């Protein structure tokens, strides 16, 4: 019903609807010195659906709750793009991060804004990891596919560590213990013709049994990861619809701000202009 322009002493301003002394309806808000811009819908003091543009031209397009990115949304940050769920200002739980320049992506679960839980990481050269992540790193069990070698086994702080099996499409395989992406501990190596090799890099049959067990586990962990990746893909697609809804409210807010304050400079378009 009412609205207008309110100028803050730091150079920013709110221009849009208000009701009961709170931002309401649609509105555009700029930060200190007019730097940074939210444009979208509001409900009694809180953003709902809209676009935040940083001075660099980077953007968040999607849903908000209690003053934070929350729900579905898409973040464009130059080196990469994130689409999917947001929880109280952080990426997650389910979503996809995709490189702007290459094929590299991560699809799966996130915790505290980091790759964490289960997912599929696809690398620049087209190879994959599928399985467990902890705090951004391959940690637990998972399957490392190359571009046709494949590792199935244990991981610790982003490196093969513990029991694991490495088998190339030539038959060259290693079953045993590992340390830092390097054969280390008890474990043999089978040749393509069949020639078995060194024991230490009796108790080797134990390390091979532990290796083949961890490879079996890793294959199950990759299966879980594949299910999580599929859900992350569905939530990234829902976030494409969230971004479009956010831009719809942003454009309504730009129009209103234009009517309410024809002279107020909306910085968002110029930010995005050459990005």
């Amino acid at each position: 019903m009412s609205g207008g322009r309110f100028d803050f002493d730091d150079g920013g301003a709110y221009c849009g609807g208000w009701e009961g002394g709170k931002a309401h309806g649609h509105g555009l808000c700029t930060g200190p010195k007019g730097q940074g811009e939210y444009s979208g819908s509001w409900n009694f003091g809180f953003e709902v659906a809209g676009v935040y543009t940083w001075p660099s031209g980077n953007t968040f397009e999607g849903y908000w709750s209690q003053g934070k990115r929350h729900g579905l949304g898409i973040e464009t940050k130059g080196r990469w793009l994130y689409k999917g769920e947001w929880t109280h200002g952080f990426k997650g739980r389910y979503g996809i991060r995709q490189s702007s320049s290459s094929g590299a992506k991560y699809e799966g679960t996130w915790n505290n804004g980091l790759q964490d839980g289960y997912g599929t990481e696809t690398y620049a050269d087209g190879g994959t990891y599928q399985g467990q992540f902890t705090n951004g790193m391959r940690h637990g069990y998972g399957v490392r596919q190359s571009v046709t070698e494949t590792y199935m086994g244990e991981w610790k702080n982003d490196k093969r560590s513990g029991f694991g099996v490495s088998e190339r499409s030539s038959g060259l395989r290693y079953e045993g213990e590992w340390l830092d992406n390097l054969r280390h501990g008890y474990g043999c190596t089978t040749l393509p013709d069949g020639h078995r090799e060194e024991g230490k890099y009796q108790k080797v049959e134990h390390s091979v049994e532990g290796a083949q067990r961890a490879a079996a586990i890793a294959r199950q962990k990759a299966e879980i990861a594949a299910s999580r990746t599929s859900h992350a893909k569905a939530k990234a697609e829902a976030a494409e619809q969230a971004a479009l809804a956010a831009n719809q409210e942003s454009n309504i807010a730009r129009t209103l701000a234009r009517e309410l304050a024809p002279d107020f400079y909306q910085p968002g378009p110029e930010y995005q202009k050459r990005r």
Binding site: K22, G31, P32, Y38, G67, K68, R69
Partner: peptide, 15 residues
């Protein structure tokens, strides 16, 4: 890069 959001008045409290 961090999101600026103003406190009070027109805006609901956050934390």
């Amino acid at each position: 890069e961090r999101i600026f959001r103003r406190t009070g008045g027109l805006f609901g409290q956050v934390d």
